[PDB]
Amino acid sequence: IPDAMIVIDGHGIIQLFSTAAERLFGWSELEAIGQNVNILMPEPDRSRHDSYISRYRTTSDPHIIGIGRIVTGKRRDGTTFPMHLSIGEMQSGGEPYFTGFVRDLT
Amino acid sequence: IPDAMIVIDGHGIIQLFSTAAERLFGWSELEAIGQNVNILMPEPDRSRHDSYISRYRTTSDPHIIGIGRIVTGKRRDGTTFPMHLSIGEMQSGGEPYFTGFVRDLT
Ligand code: HEM
Ligand code: HEM
Ligand SMILES: [Cl-]
């Protein structure tokens, strides 16, 4: 069974939500697509997350991309869990997309 | 954004296989994982595909990465189809992975 996988666009909007992401986070892919990825985390990260993406696009200075971090995730039901996050960047049709891989540490 | 997404490791081994990829290629994620991505393409690309990955790891000079290409995919039943392929490079746990988006052009 693989880890959860999520794809966002350059403004943090979820574009793809894997089957393992559905199970872990509780949202169906249809529900998750079109929402900001910030729904998947507690405060204060949630309020700050757009700024993290914007800063990266401005500076190209990675903090988690290619680096990884243990962080706290938040499920649809409101409960939280420890998770490892890896992130990649790619271009498709001239626009940036970020792919995140989420390992449930519980 | 194409709906079909495939993730491979630095040796071409499938790590993740999204639901649209499963539908398009006719393989379960549970079955695709651990197989070489070369199962998804006809010859001659199939038997050259490892060399493409290894040459990229050597040179860091993209061919398809960041650019895209129309290529031929192969379903489990042997039938083929035109597809647009987009690819990005990423790192997780200090190892390279490749994120591929597949657009069926049928
Ligand atoms: C769901 C739990 C998540 C948490 C708690 C979280 C938290 C964070 C934090 C704290 C940063 C800033 C790092 C720093 O400046 O110290 C960050 C950056 C970023 N995150 Fe999230 N994130 C989560 C999920 C995701 C996912 C799933 C993606 C991609 C699909 C993603 C994409 C990004 C991007 C593109 C950046 C900016 C690049 C970078 O700083 O390396 N995040 N995230
Ligand atoms: C299934 C249909 C596919 C076909 C027919 C195909 C074919 C090719 C071709 C023709 C090249 C360029 C060879 C050259 O430079 O001479 C290539 C390179 C490459 N492909 Fe595949 N590919 C397919 C799927 C994928 C997928 C899904 C991924 C990733 C998940 C992937 C990862 C790579 C990588 C990492 C390279 C080398 C880097 C680059 O070209 O920039 N391929 N592939
Ligand atoms: Cl990582």
From Swiss-Prot, chains A, B:
<feature type="domain" description="PAC 2">
    <location>
        <begin position="58"/>
        <end position="106"/>
    </location>
</feature>
<protein>
    <recommendedName>
        <fullName>Sensor protein FixL</fullName>
    </recommendedName>
</protein>
<feature type="domain" description="PAS 2">
    <location>
        <begin position="1"/>
        <end position="57"/>
    </location>
</feature>
<comment type="function">
    <text>Putative oxygen sensor; modulates the activity of FixJ, a transcriptional activator of nitrogen fixation fixK gene. FixL probably acts as a kinase that phosphorylates FixJ.</text>
</comment>
<feature type="binding site" description="axial binding residue">
    <location>
        <position position="49"/>
    </location>
    <ligand>
        <name>heme</name>
    </ligand>
</feature>
